[PDB]
Amino acid sequence: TSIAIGSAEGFNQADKAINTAVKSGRWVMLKNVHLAPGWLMQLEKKLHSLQPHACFRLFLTMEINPKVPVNLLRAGRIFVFEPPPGVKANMLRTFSSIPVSRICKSPNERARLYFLLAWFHAIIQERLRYAPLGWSKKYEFGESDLRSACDTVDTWLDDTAKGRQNISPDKIPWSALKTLMAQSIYGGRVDNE
Amino acid sequence: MALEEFLKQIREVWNTYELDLVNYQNKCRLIRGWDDLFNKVKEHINSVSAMKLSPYYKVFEEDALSWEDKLNRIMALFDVWIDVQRRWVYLEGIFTGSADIKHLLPVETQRFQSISTEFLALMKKVSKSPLVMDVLNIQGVQRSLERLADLLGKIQKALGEYLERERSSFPRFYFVGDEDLLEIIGNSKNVAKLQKHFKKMFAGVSSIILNEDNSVVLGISSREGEEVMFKTPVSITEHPKINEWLTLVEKEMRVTLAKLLAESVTEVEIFGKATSIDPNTYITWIDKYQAQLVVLSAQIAWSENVETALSSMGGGGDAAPLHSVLSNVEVTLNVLADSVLMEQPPLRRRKLEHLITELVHQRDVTRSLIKSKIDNAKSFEWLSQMRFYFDPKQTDVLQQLSIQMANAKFNYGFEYLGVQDKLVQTPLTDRCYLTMTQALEARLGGSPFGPAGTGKTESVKALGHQLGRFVLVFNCDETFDFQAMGRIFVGLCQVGAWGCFDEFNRLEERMLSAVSQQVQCIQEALREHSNPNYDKTSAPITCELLNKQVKVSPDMAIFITMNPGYAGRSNLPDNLKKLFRSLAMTKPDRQLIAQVMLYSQGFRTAEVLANKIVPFFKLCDEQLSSQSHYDFGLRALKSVLVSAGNVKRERIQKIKREKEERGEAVDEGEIAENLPEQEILIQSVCETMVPKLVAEDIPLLFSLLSDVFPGVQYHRGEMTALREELKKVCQEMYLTYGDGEEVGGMWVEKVLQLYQITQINHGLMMVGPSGSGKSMAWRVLLKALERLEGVEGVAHIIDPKAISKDHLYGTLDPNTREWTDGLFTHVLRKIIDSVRGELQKRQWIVFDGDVDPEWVENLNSVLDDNKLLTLPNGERLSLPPNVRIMFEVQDLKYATLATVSRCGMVWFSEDVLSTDMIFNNFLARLRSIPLDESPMLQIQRDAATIMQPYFTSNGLVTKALEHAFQLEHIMDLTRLRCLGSLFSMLHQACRNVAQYNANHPDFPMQIEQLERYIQRYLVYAILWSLSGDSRLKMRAELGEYIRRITTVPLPTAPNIPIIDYEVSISGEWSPWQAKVPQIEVETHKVAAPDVVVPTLDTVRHEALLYTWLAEHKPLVLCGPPGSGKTMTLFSALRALPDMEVVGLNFSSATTPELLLKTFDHYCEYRRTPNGVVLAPVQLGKWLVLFCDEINLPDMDKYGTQRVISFIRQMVEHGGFYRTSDQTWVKLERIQFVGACNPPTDPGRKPLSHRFLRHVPVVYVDYPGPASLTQIYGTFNRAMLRLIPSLRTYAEPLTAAMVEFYTMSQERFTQDTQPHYIYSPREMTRWVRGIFEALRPLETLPVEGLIRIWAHEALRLFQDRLVEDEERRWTDENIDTVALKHFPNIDREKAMSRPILYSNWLSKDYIPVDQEELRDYVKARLKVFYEEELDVPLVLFNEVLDHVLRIDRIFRQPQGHLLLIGVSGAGKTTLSRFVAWMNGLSVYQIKVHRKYTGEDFDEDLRTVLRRSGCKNEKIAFIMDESNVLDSGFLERMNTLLANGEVPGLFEGDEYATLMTQCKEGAQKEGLMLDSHEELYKWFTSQVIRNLHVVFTMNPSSEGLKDRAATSPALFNRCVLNWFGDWS
Amino acid sequence: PAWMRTLHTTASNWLHLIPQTLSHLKRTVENIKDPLFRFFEREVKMGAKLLQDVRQDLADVVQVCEGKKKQTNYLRTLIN
């Protein structure tokens, strides 16, 4: 049960979902909980005096914000999500996120296209670290851009390759992918010539 | 006798006038012809006033008087009846046509049956005798109509659920408010009333076409008159239900648009694949079909031609038929350009412009395709374009057309868009189209972000219109919460419409996170709708919105346009950002948008014009001076290009008219060839940009024009008729009019520029410093336009910052989801509805006040081209063409680029309104308007003649003002503040002359005496107006300068300044010292609160304040705390018996609500023919609202004090707005006096210049050492008369007092501690304490007097000290001062360090031994333990000191304590012990976690009831921890300062309090019956009985914060620093 | 006080470093036609205004640090 924090009915839904899941053993995720620190303190106090089901899990997804209560941080286990340390780590994360069955489809060139996409994403995200030289500003090149690029690659490869096992590299729609990534997927965030 | 003839005419008209009645479905005879009746009443009222003007009026006065009353009554009745009738009509249609409402809502159905019976009975009575007077003479008719209106309103408000269900029935009703939805549902039978509501439910359908019966819907029409005729007309008789035939109309609209598109495509296939096109055939085809249809057909033909050419070239080595496509496009473009070069009908002209834009885009695309050597139709260089494919073989007409971009495929929605302004399709609108279509194919939203003026909101609209979608634009703000956005989403999903939520980042971050859920579920529903596995035969795709299953239409989409570069905007959560595909729209291609715009408008040199005009705008941006109101962006180029097209059309029409009236020879080609397009563009550029320019930038911009456009000159038109109207209006308004370089020419030019801007922009801003003539400019323009065009001008002036944004725009109730209209919303909706003909008048909504993004960014869609006021409840109000939105501001330092860009600017400088103009206005008003309401007029005329030489250019007043601007004043000096002060003082001089004439009927003032008096008083008033708010040194400087520069006789004293002299009525200077006698105060009146020892400053300030108050002019006293501002004001008001003063104590949390509570208590609202008037309950008395801390109220982040804006509106405009019903309330018999500390003091803010313009400021500084010596020597001489042996010690003692005071005031300042404020208040308390000690004693040696003096010095100057070294300094310096001024005394006897005084061991206040006091306190503590509190206390010396101090304060009237020290030091326990000793009952508020402001109000009511009605002495002990909100501190501040909270007792609580006060007064033996006397007695009792003891910790920043949050804690509470235990 | 003396020395040194005079450009009928002058006049105007404001503020700070003049709200904010 996924609930986005921020509204009073959102708090009611969160309370009801937690009360149901601590008995049924289902998972409850609450997003952007950093926007309600007082309700976070109340939630920590509620969680301390509780004996939930063995399979119950409560995920609280937030941004790193000093307003998050300290007692909640001590009560839970913290996982920090941030850009991967390097190109190799970025490519490993990309290859882990993308399902194997998606890459290993009918065209044998899809694997190489996905590898090139992963390398491009890793290079761009690593260039983001050097803010004035790698880019001009800290662009939000993230997972959404990678997913959109993968969807575009899949769409245009299935369009060009009508279920064939192999497609000649000359026939791959390079212009389509390049233009859509430069103008729509990655170039949409770019506001600099 | 013409008055009698006209009265007889009116009598005959009203005796013959009958209400025009028309039958209503055989139910009753409804009144018809409201406009004629209202116009007749207005005309007769104006005529009666015109007769009141004449003198002969008297012989008929009473009769005419009687007439107006009847007339007024008539108006009043018919100001209600119409509304009533209208309401009933639609309510009837809801309770009769619909059968489900009786089962759903039976109770108010029966209620409406009863009220309908009453209404039909009344209508039958009217039908029996349709005479207007006979109707007016019906008993209780007015009350009956008001009761019917109230009941109808309650029923109408009790119909929300039915309206929601009806919205569910017809989804487009989600975009219609409850009022208009009720109107639509009720008036379903009478279709003619629904025509004004179709614009809110459809994109381009403004009205529908019916037959003569109004039973068959033959088609639809747009706002431009374009009509679409249905192939299958919709029959209303077959489908009586409103929603059913509305749905049929919408479906038939789509079907007929599809069929007409098919026919248009079949027709336009001829023009395609054709080498030469006949212009007549193309024009006939264009006229045959709609604008969107002809553009769509052209796009389809071009796309199919390009596809055929690419299929032909697919071989690679084949020929290139793409050149054929380019040639056909160029031929058609040449035909279109030839067509737009000659006169065309406006609809065909717009069609031709759209076709030119589309074909220029097509030509560019085809040239790009040819240049890229494209031979395959599957090349992405062709696939990335927007391609239109038509399939005539498709059975479903709605699916015959497909629009494809890359892999994205869309179906045309076939929504009728009317004639929409098409956007040049530049490269960024192509990139925008590509990115947004990619987002749509992924079932995501679109997010074009970037600065403002880039195309984000229109590019979204243009893409939606290109796909034939209904795009709804929403101007988001912080009030778009989860529920409002969810309901908007429900409406969009059910309708199948595009939602463009602009300024999306203005929502709260929590609200964005919450709305992410709805966006995600909507996108999931859309994605499951896209899968081919889904079949429409199955259950429709639904989503979970607002706990409801809402069907989702595949045509729906969500777009958000935002500018992330604004600081203070919300950050979208990542889970919300991942739902949208973002695109940076930063640099629009302005060169192409111009070139294409000028090409489509008929300019032959469009390329040269664009290449000259875009760099010109860049040059203006980068070369003119940087101003906050300058905008040279895209919304300013498109404003110039549109104006250029309009000006070219006007010039062509003018040339044709000249040719017609001079011979007969007209040729379109000759005119087009011989036409100065350069001059047209320059004229538009000037008309748009010159008004905003500052004086120095005009030559720069004209030099830029000469550089970029050499040889062309801008000669502005000479609007002779408008200038004559302006001259007449200025003459009747006492305003100076001038032509060119004459006095006032700049102002008249600014007025003409404002008139020019009104015609181009529906949003205006008059930007300029206070007193630059903006208000007079637009008022005179409105009156002149009314007199010239004959259109009545109505202006609604709104102060946007004097009220909250909720009160300005409206409030959505979080519980019942009911919308309450704000001020601007109510005004705009009333104009739009046009119940009383508001659409036939020129409506100007002037936002006079400060502009900040928070309130004005809600007007982006209004001041844009959407012209829509978007509300959170999904309602959209279209701005009528006759409405102008005006912003009269003094600066734009807080407005953003989005606001500045959307509005036309007129810059008024202080040089526009010269000082000669103000002098002329003053002199004309003096010579014309009598001061009494004629000997007074003759006196004014003579005085104006005498003052004429000095009120000239380079005159005495002008030079004096110029010199005074160089001095230093306690407040910022503005010209109009000084000029208003001087004019008020001169009016007072004229009134003084009139009073002298009245006092001497036999011998009135002669010419020479009047001249002498007026000249001397002019010098005196210049001194007191140009230097009143400055120190004595600056007053002396101004006096010396005037003596240098004046020819008026002046006092010949070698060193005494002129400021020390007054002007006697005999026309001679007389020293002020002659009015300052050495008075002898009574012994029992020593240092009393109302006793004032006259001094020079006292008498001068009293005279000045009397001068300013007698004119009812609001005024301000600025000075250090304790200087004597309140004392001087009360002493001056004592000379004005017809003035009742009410004291308000401003704090940092003060809002206009305090003033509203004071008005609700001391004043009353009454209804008059002219509106609502708020006047004091007392008759013949003027209420003086004395605000004591005017500059304390909090200034927001945009530099505005809301209460200061409220007071400025109430002074400048003479009233305010009631937000309960948004009604203008006019103040009567109310004036304003304010007091403040200098703005440089901590916590004080500088008052607005607009506010300071209306309030003269007088600087009341601390009395000097000589003044202090005089005042307190008088007090000490009065006091020491009790003991004769001490009388000879009156002179030294005072000196010692003064000396020590001065020393303390020099040693302890606010730099060390915030509360280190020493004032003559301390000296008054010193005299009071010594007098109280000496009063019971019959004799006393000098040593006892010195001991009392030292004790009082310790209690006043040492109790507040924080550090020990400060207290040691105070002790040592008291000793040294006493020895210095009292030698030869027993030092040890009078200065034994334990200086303790107490009345516990005796009847009198005599010195007490420490050990005896300790034993007595021990015994009293034992009794205290055995009776009240059994908490043993250890007694040490500081405890004895503290209990003595607390007893001292508890024995004083209105004695409040502020004990500051570490928690646990015993402050509360000692306070309770002393209160028990003195017999006071201890009251403490029991604060818990649920303790709110209402609980504190109840506790305050209990305390006030006990201490004011029951005569019970109460010590109210309050701790800083008990304060949970700032309202606690506000009420405590008011109670501490005044002794009564104004809004604490209201409703039945006030009645109960009045009954208890009457009982208490009867117990005391007083005869009080009136509520005012009862409240005054209650306040006196509360003052005498309630002692508030405030305890807090010794915080550093907390004390400084409290010094501003609760000022009375440091002025009315004695501060005792207990601190920590030493 | 220590911070008062430190701020006094810093403000005196800053006043020594910053120049004192900057004369506005003179308008002429033929000077306006030159875009370079149209830009340099803006440059000099802004520079002179900022220089005057900064010099006045630093002089006020030095005056406060010596106790000759009282602290105001703007002076308190600037010193902070």
Ligand SMILES: Nc1ncnc2c1ncn2[C@@H]1O[C@H](COP(=O)(O)OP(=O)(O)OP(=O)(O)O)[C@@H](O)[C@H]1O
């Ligand atoms: N044409 C005129 N000739 C003479 N006096 C004028 C003229 N126009 C305005 N004034 C006077 O000059 C003063 C300016 O008032 P006005 O209301 O025009 O100023 P404003 O720009 O609205 O100031 P603020 O910004 O404070 O509202 C008033 O005394 C006004 O009556």
Ligand SMILES: Nc1ncnc2c1ncn2[C@@H]1O[C@H](COP(=O)(O)OP(=O)(O)O)[C@@H](O)[C@H]1O
């Ligand atoms: N391609 C274009 N062709 C013509 N006018 C355009 C074009 N792009 C923007 N405009 C105009 O620019 C102005 C600002 O555009 P708009 O989208 O309202 O701004 P914003 O992006 O700040 O919301 C409007 O007058 C709009 O019609």
Ligand SMILES: Nc1ncnc2c1ncn2[C@@H]1O[C@H](COP(=O)(O)OP(=O)(O)O)[C@@H](O)[C@H]1O
């Ligand atoms: N001429 C005077 N005669 C009597 N009291 C005076 C005179 N001048 C100053 N004072 C004292 O100055 C104080 C003024 O305080 P108040 O009237 O509250 O002024 P403010 O509102 O400016 O603080 C009073 O204590 C008053 O007795």
Ligand SMILES: Nc1ncnc2c1ncn2[C@@H]1O[C@H](COP(=O)(O)OP(=O)(O)O)[C@@H](O)[C@H]1O
């Ligand atoms: N002189 C004293 N001797 C003994 N106990 C004291 C003394 N002064 C204060 N106390 C203690 O203070 C407690 C309550 O503190 P209180 O008087 O309420 O101080 P505060 O209100 O400043 O917190 C009492 O229970 C008592 O024990």
